[PDB]
Design an enzyme around this catalytic site. Structure first.
Site, PDB file in Angstrom:
ATOM      1  N   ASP A 325       0.813  -1.216   0.000  1.00 11.93           N
ATOM      2  CA  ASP A 325       0.000   0.000   0.000  1.00 11.93           C
ATOM      3  C   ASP A 325       0.850   1.271   0.000  1.00 11.93           C
ATOM      4  O   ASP A 325       0.722   2.126  -0.878  1.00 11.93           O
ATOM      5  CB  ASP A 325      -0.902   0.008   1.233  1.00 11.93           C
ATOM      6  CG  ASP A 325      -0.121   0.211   2.520  1.00 11.93           C
ATOM      7  OD1 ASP A 325       0.941  -0.433   2.675  1.00 11.93           O
ATOM      8  OD2 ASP A 325      -0.567   1.014   3.369  1.00 11.93           O
ATOM      9  N   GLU A 354       4.556   0.355  -2.732  1.00 13.30           N
ATOM     10  CA  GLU A 354       4.132   1.623  -3.303  1.00 13.30           C
ATOM     11  C   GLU A 354       5.109   2.736  -2.966  1.00 13.30           C
ATOM     12  O   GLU A 354       5.049   3.326  -1.885  1.00 13.30           O
ATOM     13  CB  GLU A 354       2.730   2.034  -2.836  1.00 13.30           C
ATOM     14  CG  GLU A 354       2.270   3.330  -3.524  1.00 13.30           C
ATOM     15  CD  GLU A 354       0.854   3.775  -3.181  1.00 13.30           C
ATOM     16  OE1 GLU A 354      -0.094   2.975  -3.358  1.00 13.30           O
ATOM     17  OE2 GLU A 354       0.687   4.937  -2.750  1.00 13.30           O
ATOM     18  N   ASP A 421      -5.218   5.445  -7.069  1.00 12.16           N
ATOM     19  CA  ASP A 421      -4.597   6.550  -6.337  1.00 12.16           C
ATOM     20  C   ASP A 421      -4.504   7.826  -7.179  1.00 12.16           C
ATOM     21  O   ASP A 421      -4.294   8.916  -6.643  1.00 12.16           O
ATOM     22  CB  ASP A 421      -3.190   6.150  -5.863  1.00 12.16           C
ATOM     23  CG  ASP A 421      -3.196   5.429  -4.521  1.00 12.16           C
ATOM     24  OD1 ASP A 421      -2.128   4.922  -4.110  1.00 12.16           O
ATOM     25  OD2 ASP A 421      -4.262   5.376  -3.872  1.00 12.16           O
TER      26      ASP A 421
END
Lengths: 583, 583
Positions: A325, A354, A421
């Protein structure tokens, strides 16, 4: 010889082992202020008997820099070296310290790569290359199970769609339209968070050991995985190992127990009370969302929890890896211990994290396998979509980072272009399927792993977190087939050859104020060459090639282009999604 | 603005946490082609509310580079930033990627230090600073026990002494003349290998779990340690964790069992037979000494052995740390696991490794605590002894490496000048006590940890492995007291103040073709200033100072120098071991 420009640092991308015997050496200098540069290496013991200048070659050139390759196989899995840095007839060799003028007498002051330890070696799951991703937000993808929640039904919007409220996307759904992706032609799938959370985005993890009730359970997941591992498609799960939803038990304790809480250190305490109101989250949270405290990743018990957690699913779900994440904020240590673990459970496990910024730190074979190649992304989009950067700039951005990372990791870069995102490729452009196509292509034309945000192969206009995560369109009517076809083609195409997979990668055109691109890739069987035209319209090109091959067959249309003059003529309609190989 | 010169890489020395809240930022550029440079940082979330330019200051300048300090305490243990890089009225700020011309709008493309995790933090045993080493070769130091071997008695040579044969140095001996070192005034002691080996140098380890019979046993060691830990002196033991003496059991097996050997992988196999003769060691050895095979540090069982080994002694002997015979060739992984271990046994454990080259790799708080600062050594000797480098060069070499490492590690550098692996300071010069003294001084004048090779305080002319390791002189007659006194003084002196310990460190003279040096260090109580003269003879100096203080008291002679003009006059006899503070 513009001396103050060169750089060489041990490890990272400037010195690393590709395998357990061969090693690569990178070196940077001014754009064209370097005739040549040889790598002077060997063994730090019997120097005068193992030294061999390795002709470093130019592999990339960003704005103001020249980088150099160099394939070395230390006779005895160990190497001490320097560099030549040559220009004209002017020579000056680089040592661990200064820039000598006369060949270094003692290897003592020369750079050194201790010993090739096949363990420290970076070995990211090579199956990624062959593989081609496809991201998916469980929340609003498919709902093959009517039991979810009370809020909102399927799709409704068009230009201003999807609010931060609710929808009933489930796993079963994925189990349904699975043969659909099978049609699309995928290799792998990245799943956003899907762990007992209390929001549409499952980043509000309540329990790292359970699938949100609405979504389903292990079986559903497994039953979903099994058909995937049957359709030859890996699977990835989101690892919210940094912050935990306000719900998360240990937190509650601290909240409803203030100080005395036995889980006081499971996070990060700043103020006795757990108040915030308008002041500031009395505890280290994600950004500034109290409903997401940062886990004390250093805490012992906390470790195991997440640890056994990570391995758990891998172990039982048999997933194909973890996406992190947000890792650029979690202890690098846990990251270390993490891998070892997710490895002893499934070596081939893929540890994707990420990291939107330069991450050569985590890519030392000591923590990750790959990352969100936003830098890459930041290029394409900054070129094809926003069209503010020219050709060279593009090639340039594909240099500062092309070399920035080691040969392997680079080859396994999760090169996407859009996600939950951020906004969507399509809107980034604006219904300009053409403009999009040329980008999506480069994606499935560069090396590393490409990723397809669900819904796009069909054509979906998103926005930001609320928009971008627009519901899926399951009504065959809304189906940009010419776009889906584009994908499939591009997909199988990415498969049809290996050069595009992980071949070379030169360039035959980038000239400053230009928008027409052409590059080359190849293996010892097939040599292909891709070209693209950004011009608001048509534009013809001219460029030379080699003879070793046999011809130039237009790929898509299976048509045939001829070498003709010592240079091949190539026409571009306006956004030339045209590319071809060469028998 | 000589753009292609600047550099900034995350981690290492170019970005690291000093503590769990404050962080340092380094940046390099051309010698004087940089008016100023501010650090533009803050939080990657509420950017427009946490940004504060941090005036990076010039901390060091090597030949062609300017480096910059910058103390940052991220409001929320996290920071995203860029740099200013200013000149005249010309401004250009550095981002993760390019060099902007207008203040970066979105912190997105800015450098970033994930989050300050007090675990990943580098915390080398701060007790080293206060501490002052003293190396010792067990083999030929003291023999308080007549039971050793049949070969050679104590000292015999003078100019060509000590052959690679034998002598009976024991631990008991150390237990004897311990009150002697107590007289010398030591803080710590590094012991060369002393594990069941079959040679004078115990690097031919037979058993990593026993003290050579001749030397003694655990008790002797312990009984030796106990009085040390009583005289306030730490202790270090050599870790031959890379190669094992031909003797070593698992090896024998492989030898006297060829292939079928169950310990086939405990090392590194290359040829079925274990022959070598004149060809080449059929197995990865140290350099090329068959009687020293390299251990498969990656091998599981092998790990534990050495692991429990390292901790063993720490655990029972209660030693103060491990020196790593040769670490720049042992799996970086084992090195990782190593620390954690030697930490859960004795946090304050000191993990020193033998790395003669730039080792910012191991000094990431992920593997070591310190190393053999040969680079440093390579400077002093290259200046005071060989006297081939001038003043500036010296300051220059104290820049490429002064910044090369992080603020902490630097402060804990095992800065020696001679050892058993090289020649001796004295001979390096040649009976020029003067020339030596000025060096030994800088050693006990710079920061980090200094190390005294046994026998020298008394005056001993060594050579290489055979020479350098010359027997000890226990006959009070041979006792360069004026030299020992020099030491003691210099020692207690290194103790008498903290500025010299770990104070600042400027310079007021280095001008190119010169051999007279002067620098400054200080805390918020006492400010001292050291000066040295390399001239073949006398030489007077002139230089400015500050007022905050009160005066200038000649240290040694407790005499008194006056500011006089806005500049202090300082005379040097020829090799001015003269230095003083300033009330």
């Amino acid at each position: 010889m513009f001396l103050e420009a060169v750089y060489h640092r041990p490890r990272k991308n400037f010195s690393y082992a590709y395998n357990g015997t061969t090693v690569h050496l990178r070196i940077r200098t001014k754009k064209d202020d370097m005739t040549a540069v040889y790598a002077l290496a060997g063994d730090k013991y019997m120097w005068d008997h193992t030294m061999e200048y390795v002709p470093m070659t130019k592999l990339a050139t960003d704005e103001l820099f020249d980088y150099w390759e160099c394939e070395v196989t230390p006779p005895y899995r160990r190497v001490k070296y320097g560099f030549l840095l040559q220009q004209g007839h002017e020579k000056r060799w680089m040592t661990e310290y200064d820039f000598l003028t006369e060949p270094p007498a003692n290897p003592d002051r020369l750079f050194e790569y201790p010993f090739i330890n096949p363990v420290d070696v970076f070995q990211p799951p090579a199956w990624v290359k062959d593989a081609i991703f496809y991201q998916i937000f469980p929340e609003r993808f498919a709902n093959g199970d009517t039991r979810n929640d009370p809020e909102g039904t399927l799709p409704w919007g068009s230009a201003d769609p999807t609010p931060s409220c609710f929808f009933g996307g489930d796993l079963q759904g994925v189990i349904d339209h699975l043969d659909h992706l099978s049609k699309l032609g995928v290799n792998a799938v990245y799943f956003t968070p899907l762990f007992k959370a209390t929001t549409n985005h499952k980043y509000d993890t309540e329990d790292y050991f359970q699938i949100d009730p609405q979504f389903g359970d292990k079986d559903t997941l497994k039953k979903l995985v099994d058909l995937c591992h049957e359709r030859g498609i890996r699977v990835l799960l989101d690892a919210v190992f940094n912050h935990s939803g306000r719900t998360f038990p240990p937190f509650v304790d601290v909240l409803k127990n203030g100080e005395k809480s036995k889980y006081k250190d499971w996070f990060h305490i700043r103020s006795l009370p757990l108040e915030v109101v308008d002041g500031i989250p009395t505890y280290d949270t994600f950004a500034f969302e109290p409903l997401m405290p940062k886990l004390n990743t250093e805490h012992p018990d906390v470790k195991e929890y997440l640890l056994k957690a990570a391995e758990y699913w891998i172990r039982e779900t048999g997933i194909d890896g973890w996406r992190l994440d947000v890792a650029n904020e979690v202890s690098h240590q846990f990251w270390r211990e993490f891998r070892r673990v997710v490895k002893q459970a499934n070596p081939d496990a893929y540890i994707l994290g990420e990291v939107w910024h330069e991450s050569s730190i985590w890519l030392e074979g000591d923590q990750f396998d790959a990352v969100m190649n936003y830098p890459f992304t930041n290029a394409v989009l900054d070129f094809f979509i926003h069209q503010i950067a020219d050709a060279e700039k593009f090639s340039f951005m594909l240099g500062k980072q092309l070399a920035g990372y080691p040969r392997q990791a680079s080859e396994v870069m999760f090169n996407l272009l859009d996600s939950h995102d951020t906004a969507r490729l399509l809107t980034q452009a604006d219904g300009d399927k053409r403009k999009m196509k040329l980008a999506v292509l480069f994606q499935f034309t560069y090396f590393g792993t490409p990723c397809i945000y669900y819904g796009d192969e069909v054509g979906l206009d998103g926005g930001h977190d609320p928009g971008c995560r627009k519901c899926m369109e399951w009504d065959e009517t809304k189906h940009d087939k010419d776009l889906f076809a584009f994908y499939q083609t591009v997909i199988r195409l990415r498969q049809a050859h290996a050069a595009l997979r992980t071949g070379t990668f030169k360039f035959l055109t980038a000239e400053k104020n230009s928008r027409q691109i052409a590059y080359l890739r190849e293996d010892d069987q097939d040599t292909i060459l891709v070209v693209m035209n950004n011009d608001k319209a048509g534009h013809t090109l001219t460029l030379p090639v080699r003879h070793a091959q046999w011809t130039h067959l237009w790929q898509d249309d299976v048509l045939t282009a001829a070498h003709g003059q010592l240079t091949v003529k190539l026409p571009a309609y306006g956004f030339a999604v045209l590319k071809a190989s060469s028998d």
